[PDB]
Amino acid sequence: IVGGYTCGANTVPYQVSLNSGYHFCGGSLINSQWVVSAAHCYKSGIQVRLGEDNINVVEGNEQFISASKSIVHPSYNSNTLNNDIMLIKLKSAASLNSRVASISLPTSCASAGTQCLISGWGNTKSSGTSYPDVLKCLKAPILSDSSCKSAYPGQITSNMFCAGYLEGGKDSCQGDSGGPVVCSGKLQGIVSWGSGCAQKNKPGVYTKVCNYVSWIKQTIASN
Numbered sequence: 001i002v003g004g005y006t007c008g009a010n011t012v013p014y015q016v017s018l019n020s021g022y023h024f025c026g027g028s029l030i031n032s033q034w035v036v037s038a039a040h041c042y043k044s045g046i047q048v049r050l051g052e053d054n055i056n057v058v059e060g061n062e063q064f065i066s067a068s069k070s071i072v073h074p075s076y077n078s079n080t081l082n083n084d085i086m087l088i089k090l091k092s093a094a095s096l097n098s099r100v101a102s103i104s105l106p107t108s109c110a111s112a113g114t115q116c117l118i119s120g121w122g123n124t125k126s127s128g129t130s131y132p133d134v135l136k137c138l139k140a141p142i143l144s145d146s147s148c149k150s151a152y153p154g155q156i157t158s159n160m161f162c163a164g165y166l167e168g169g170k171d172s173c174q175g176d177s178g179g180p181v182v183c184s185g186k187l188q189g190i191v192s193w194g195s196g197c198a199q200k201n202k203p204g205v206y207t208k209v210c211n212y213v214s215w216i217k218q219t220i221a222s223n
């Protein structure tokens with residue numbers, strides 16, 4: 001399968017579903033008490049759902065935990081989606097196992113051409129509305145900054161990256177907001193935006209997590 005595929009149950013154990021009566025966004029578990037997501041996913045009364053596969057069915061590996069806190073990045077701009085990152089505290093610590101695991105923070109930024117894993121539940125159709133119910137996966141390289149910016153002129157900042165193919169076809173536009181981009185076992189990206197939807201020269205656009213690591217560590221330790 002060249003593109004969107006079915007991950008397999010609990011193959012991506014750091015993957016979280018944010019629920020407000022429905023699944024509205026994804027997120028990543030970074031330690032037993034904290035989740036990172038996109039700031040554009042900011043909402044009151046979240047329930048964070050861990051160990052999911054089929055989000056409509058109780059399949060036995062779940063943990064359902066209310067969010068106690070959310071902290072949107074102080075420089076988040078909801079017009080440009082610059083600094084599209086938010087931290088979510090769990091009311092109770094999650095219980096960690098094979099299917100519920102934390103993802104490490106990067107120690108450096110990943111380079112262009114690095115193959116990454118993008119995951120989520122969101123829309124599959126470049127042209128229509130089709131929302132599947134088990135965890136979906138995509139493997140794509142990080143594009144060069146040039147390639148990214150020339151696809152979205154004036155719209156890409158240092159705190160963003162693109163991943164995929166300049167011919168489009170395979171993309172995570174609405175492909176599940178808030179969800180992870182993981183490269184070499186490290187969390188590099190957060191599913192942020194993408195003008196169009198898998199259009200020719202319209203990749204996915206991700207929050208460049210490697211710029212925020214000091215913010216994340218300082219903030220979680222203080223909160």
Ligand SMILES: [Ca+2]
Binds near residue numbers: 056057
């Ligand atoms: Ca389930």
